[PDB]
Amino acid sequence: AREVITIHVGELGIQIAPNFWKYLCDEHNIDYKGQEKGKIRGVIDNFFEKASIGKWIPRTILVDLGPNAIRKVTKKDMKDFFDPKRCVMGLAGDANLFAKGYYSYGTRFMEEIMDKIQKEVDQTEHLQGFIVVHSIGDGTGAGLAPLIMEAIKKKHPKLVMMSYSIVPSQNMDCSTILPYNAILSLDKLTSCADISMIIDNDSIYRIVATQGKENELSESIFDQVLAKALVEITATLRFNSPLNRSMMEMSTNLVPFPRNHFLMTSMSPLETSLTSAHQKIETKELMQDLIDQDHILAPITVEKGVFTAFVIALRGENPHSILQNSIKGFGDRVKFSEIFPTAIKADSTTLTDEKLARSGITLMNHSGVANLFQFLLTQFELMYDHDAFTTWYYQEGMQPSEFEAAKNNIQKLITEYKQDEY
């Protein structure tokens, strides 16, 4: 079993954990106590460790510079599921600064963190890779997640590392220093991860609100959508799928150059509870929905930008003759460079959710990511050039040239993604 180790870093990555792990528990027929619930299905071993007893243990580590995200997750939301010896807690938190997560505070926990990671690594014969789930907003997520990633890559250089980077909103999750942490941490993700998924919370809020225009939803829906997208990305790593069979294949399929690894996603039906009653989603509509504006979890229109890679992973019966006509029917909405064939790959895997006829998710390497980076970079520059809030970072060791370096690296990254636009 090619086993994956999942690490949740920061208050949001931890907030997500109970939704992510409950989906996996139900998907594979395991209860929330780790007990088997009937017949186990899928390659359970890839995400769960088998205990000396009948219990399955999520193969995961929770990291928080304060005590609170972990305390709520392991004591109130999903009791007895997470192993307490795999939880790392600090006391001070991060004061919302990148500087604490990466230079002044979070560094004292690296021996503890790498020790716990090795204990988890030592339990597996065939380790495929790591998934690091983190916010790029707050200092713990923005700071430690790259600190952890670098420590792992220097010890286990042959593994594939994937990050799930969550970009906070400009409204419900906003912060007055968001642009500093976002640029300072993109600068490190650029050299740290092999694959980096970008999920934009503002897209989630407007997409769910659109789907919910007819009803009252639930406040839990925003977290369920964010958690589900990770579960679906990973579906092919858990079931014997004819696609993204392994993390190494995701890397070879989607990332042509070491720096161009930032990926976008699209998902349909977003959540089962959003699409209820008569939901006979025919193979034809599902593929049109996946390139629709209201299914893309980014401020990206596929028609406005250029594709470098595009993989569509469906679940349930999806006849191949339909998938091919749907792709041909994309026309010029899905366009690549003249140095590439229109390398759009699609197929389907096993469905576990008894309420849905079919579903799917896509992974896109598209130039539109550059627009998010430029948006955040412009905000960074307005603040930086007039020293807003820089004293708080300088006080913890961020010599000013550190900010200048991040500024230049991101402008170069934006420039490179837009090369095919010109």
Which residues sit at the interface with another protein, rule CB under 8 A?
A: 1-2, 43, 126, 128, 240, 242, 245-246, 248-253, 255-258, 308-309, 319-322, 324, 327-328, 331-332, 335, 338-345
Do β-strands 359-366 and 262-268 pair in parallel, antiparallel, or remain unpaired? Answer: antiparallel
> To the nearest whole angstrom, how small is the minimum distance from the Cβ of residue 355 to another protein?
24
The amino acid present at 333, given as its one-letter code, is R
> To the nearest whole angstrom, how small is the minimum distance from the Cβ of residue 124 to another protein?
13
CA–CA distance from 372 to each of 30, 185, 221, 248, 349 (Å)?
39, 14, 24, 27, 32
Nearer to another protein, 75 or 320 (CB): 320
The CA dihedral of 143, 149, 154, 156, to the nearest 10 degrees, is: 160
Nearer to another protein, 212 or 242 (CB): 242
- Which of helix, strand or coil describes residue 82? coil
Can you tell me the distance from the alpha carbon of 255 to that of 246, in angstroms, rounded to the nearest whole number?
14
Nearer to another protein, 219 or 332 (CB): 332
Nearer to another protein, 50 or 328 (CB): 328
The amino acid present at 234, given as its one-letter code, is T
Nearer to another protein, 90 or 360 (CB): 360
> To the nearest whole angstrom, how small is the minimum distance from the Cβ of residue 131 to another protein?
16
Nearer to another protein, 130 or 380 (CB): 130
Q: What burial letters (b/e) apply to 37-62, b meaning 16+ CB within 10 Å?
A: eeeeebbbbbbbbeeeeebbbbbbbb
> To the nearest whole angstrom, how small is the minimum distance from the Cβ of residue 85 to another protein?
28
> To the nearest whole angstrom, how small is the minimum distance from the Cβ of residue 252 to another protein?
4
Other Cβ atoms closer than 10 A to 403 = 20
Nearer to another protein, 189 or 311 (CB): 311
The CA dihedral of 247, 249, 253, 254, to the nearest 10 degrees, is: 10
> To the nearest whole angstrom, how small is the minimum distance from the Cβ of residue 245 to another protein?
6
Exposed, middle or buried: residue 153 (CB in 10 Å: 0-12, 13-18, 19+)?
Answer: middle
DSSP 50: E
> To the nearest whole angstrom, how small is the minimum distance from the Cβ of residue 145 to another protein?
25
